[PDB]
Design an enzyme around this catalytic site. Structure first.
Site, PDB file in Angstrom:
ATOM      1  N   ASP A 183       1.192  -1.246  -7.107  1.00 20.85           N
ATOM      2  CA  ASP A 183       0.032  -1.000  -7.970  1.00 20.85           C
ATOM      3  C   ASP A 183      -1.058  -2.045  -7.814  1.00 20.85           C
ATOM      4  OD1 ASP A 183       1.889   0.918  -8.876  1.00 20.85           O
ATOM      5  OD2 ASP A 183       1.916   0.136 -10.926  1.00 20.85           O
ATOM      6  N   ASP A 238       5.568  10.343  -9.305  1.00 15.39           N
ATOM      7  CA  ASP A 238       5.968   8.955  -9.122  1.00 15.39           C
ATOM      8  C   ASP A 238       7.402   8.849  -8.589  1.00 15.39           C
ATOM      9  OD1 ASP A 238       5.673   6.104  -9.252  1.00 15.39           O
ATOM     10  OD2 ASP A 238       4.578   6.301 -11.139  1.00 15.39           O
TER      11      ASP A 238
END
Length: 614
Positions: free
Chosen positions: A203, A142
């Protein structure tokens, strides 16, 4: 005829990941229960392989030697116990970290207190080796720390990729890298060759919110970068919401359809322990999975939108004369949607249409197919047994360089690259089309005889296109075929000889158009619609910013919205006027160099307001 065999390239990962349903509230027991349900539901036989532990397993602690330490109250036996369990079911195990010094568990606590230190910066080799030694087969990296710290994504993920390679080489266990940087700094430009998958947007769902078709469609639209995906490298529109509360069966099928037409990873995100029979069947549809996992590895593209919100997407499948199609209805009413063979790059010859949810052949045609599609719904088809458009064949005019490559229109083409790789390992090359952003192409083992891999490339109208390869196996010719549904045009300034360009393949709303050296890339190929839009990437409209009506109004890209500031008249005097206030598209101050801003200006006779759009 088929005379050189197509070499199968790696598919996108299939599996399940812990984030969408659990956020950071994970431990051994949670993962075990999901594995057991994954197995009981028959997901492995359908091709689902990865069990990926996302954020929440690690609170940022390390021992004095810098080794990651976990809380064994939550992870009894340590992380090797959960990989052992996953492996005992014949599955692969995934883990999760950050590119920075601290992870998303620090910057955005979601279900747990902040976790300082939860990143791998300064420990890339140590941590990748640790993950591999524990038994992990997959790692998602990430960007919360990268974003916070101001890191450069391309060079940072290159470093991570190198560490991943070394770890896998040391242990002998392959390590699949998922780049997770949310589309920041345009990963489609650089991630191929670093990793098999890269996130293309923010997301799909935030914890506490309900699954949204609007969010799904936004992620889908943002993942479409067909020149970036090929030969085992994939755009990643994020983990599936299939089966999550609120989504209907029809929405679940549409979710599968759009991910499949992209060739996206199918990483389930629902709670498998409460999954309905119908949901399991939707995840497991072998015909839809086969489209997603197609051996040719190409990304589907929009091939028609004759009426706003009524869309046909087409994907070039393995073999010849084979396509998958999604007909998508984004409107508020049921409507017929048509796909034409011409748009798919087939000739007007007979082909067979199959509905992949009905699992039945539904007719034949020499021209096209029309189906009724519900409001917000979709239909998933294949078109097979067709005849390919004629195309072109080229022999290299110098080492690794193909010249004189011809396109009837600016737009997307399928290129089949012939080569031999009679070794046990894939080799890579850098590919550059004209002066476009370069990409990396992987060449799997072929045995003694030659084979092809395929790439999608954007070409300029005419015969001045060049494809240049650097490194990798000697190639033995290329075949080039157009996808006419993707046709656009360079918008070439008369005074400058340069092209209307969106910098570095950026997709962000509000990015201003500029002059740039013409190269025929997707950021230069504008499709003029019957609605007078000039469309980039299939989904961004040339736009007079904030409906500006005066000299100097910025001309940008923006999501298409039907407004008059996105409508353009292509005039006989070479001008292009914005419908809203009648001002001309204008290269600011009659500058001719790269980076010259495009604006609206009162129309005159100057050549900085004259364009070609053919």
């Amino acid at each position: 005829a088929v005379t050189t065999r197509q070499i199968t390239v790696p598919s996108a990962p299939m599996g399940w990941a812990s984030w969408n349903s659990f956020a950071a509230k994970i431990d051994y027991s949670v993962i075990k229960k999901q594995v057991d349900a994954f197995v009981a539901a028959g997901l492995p036989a359908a091709g689902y392989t990865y069990i990926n532990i996302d954020e929440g397993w690690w609170q940022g602690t390390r021992d004095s030697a810098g080794n990651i330490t976990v809380d064994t109250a939550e992870w009894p036996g340590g992380m090797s116990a959960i990989t052992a369990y996953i492996h005992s079911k014949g599955l692969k195990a995934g883990i999760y970290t950050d590119a920075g010094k601290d992870g998303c568990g620090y910057y955005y606590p979601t279900g747990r207190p902040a976790a300082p230190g939860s990143g791998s910066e300064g420990h890339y080799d140590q941590d990748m080796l640790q993950f591999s030694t524990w038994g992990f087969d997959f790692v998602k990296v990430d960007w919360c720390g990268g974003d916070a710290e101001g890191l450069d994504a391309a060079t940072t993920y290159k470093s991570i990729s190198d560490a991943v390679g070394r770890a896998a080489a040391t242990t002998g266990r392959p390590l699949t890298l998922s780049i997770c940087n949310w589309g920041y700094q345009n990963p489609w430009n650089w991630a191929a060759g670093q990793a098999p998958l890269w996130r293309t947007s923010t997301d799909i769902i935030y914890y506490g919110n309900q699954p949204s078709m609007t969010s799904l469609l936004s992620n889908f639209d943002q993942t479409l970068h067909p020149t970036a995906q090929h030969t085992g490298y994939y755009n990643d529109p994020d983990m599936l919401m299939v089966g999550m509360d609120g989504f209907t069966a029809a929405q679940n099928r549409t979710h599968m359809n759009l991910w499949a037409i992209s060739g996206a990873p199918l990483l389930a995100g629902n709670d498998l322990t409460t999954m309905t029979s119908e949901t399991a069947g939707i995840l497991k549809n072998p015909e839809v999975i086969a489209v997603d996992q197609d051996s040719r590895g190409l990304q589907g593209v929009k091939v028609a939108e004759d009426t706003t919100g009524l869309q046909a997407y087409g994907k070039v499948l393995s073999g010849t004369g084979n396509r998958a199609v999604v007909l998508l209805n984004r409107t508020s009413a049921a409507h017929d949607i048509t796909v034409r063979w011409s748009d798919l790059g087939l000739t007007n010859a007979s082909a067979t249409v199959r509905d992949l949810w009905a699992r039945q052949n539904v007719g034949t045609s020499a021209t096209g197919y029309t189906a009724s599609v519900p409001a917000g719904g979709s239909v998933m088809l294949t078109v097979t047994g067709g005849t390919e458009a004629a195309g072109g064949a080229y022999a290299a005019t110098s080492t690794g360089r193909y010249t004189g490559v011809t396109a009837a229109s600016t737009g997307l083409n399928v290129v089949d690259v012939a080569y031999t790789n009679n070794t046990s390992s894939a080799r890579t090359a850098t590919l550059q089309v004209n002066g476009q952003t370069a990409t990396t192409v992987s060449f799997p083992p072929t045995g003694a005889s030659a084979g092809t891999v395929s790439v999608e490339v954007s070409l300029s109208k005419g015969s001045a296109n060049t494809l240049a390869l650097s490194g990798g196996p000697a190639t033995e010719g290329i075949t080039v075929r157009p996808l006419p549904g993707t046709n656009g045009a360079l918008v070439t300034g008369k005074q400058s000889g340069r092209c209307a360009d969106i910098y570095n393949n950026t997709i962000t709303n509000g990015t201003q158009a500029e002059l740039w050296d013409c190269n025929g890339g997707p950021n230069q190929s504008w499709t003029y619609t019957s609605r007078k839009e000039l469309v980039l990437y299939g989904n961004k409209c040339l736009d007079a910013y904030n409906l500006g009506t005066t000299n100097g109004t910025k001309v940008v890209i923006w999501d298409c919205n039907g407004q008059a500031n996105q409508k353009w008249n292509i005039n006989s005097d070479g001008t292009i006027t914005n419908v809203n206030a009648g001002l001309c598209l204008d290269a600011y101050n009659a500058a001719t160099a790269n980076g010259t801003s495009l604006v609206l200006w009162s129309c005159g006779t100057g050549d900085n307001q004259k364009w070609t759009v053919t």
